[PDB]
Write a sequence for this structure.
DNA sequence: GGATGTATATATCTGACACGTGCCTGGAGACTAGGGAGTAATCCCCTTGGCGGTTAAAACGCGGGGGACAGCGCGTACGTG
């Protein structure tokens, strides 16, 4: 479910939702396919996701 | 009996407001052309994540000595009347 919601947030870009509870909130959505591969691998690759 | 402090009434200042007037500059309406929005193609530059190898620059430790800083004197230059 976490992988699915991260894929939905990246593919339909949701910077406000991708920030969410992060204090810094420094999310880079350049190289969309790289972030999609990271979401397909593990959600813990993203910052403030564990 | 003379002199003194307070209270309401009228004339004058003083900025603000109602009215008047010109006039000119902004607004209403119509028309047009062109500037900018949108589309497609092509090619070069940038992004994020990796790798390998060189090597010169960065980091760390330590001695020491040069310089920052504190204290004291003095005399003169500036404050003060």
């Amino acid at each position: 479910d976490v992988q699915t919601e991260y894929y939905k947030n990246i593919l339909t870009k949701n910077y406000s939702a991708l920030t969410a509870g992060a204090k810094g909130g420094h999310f880079s959505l350049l190289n969309i396919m790289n972030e999609l591969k990271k979401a397909s691998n593990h959600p813990y690759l993203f910052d403030n996701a564990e």
Remarks:
- The CA atoms of residues 3 and 42 of chain A lie 7 Å apart.
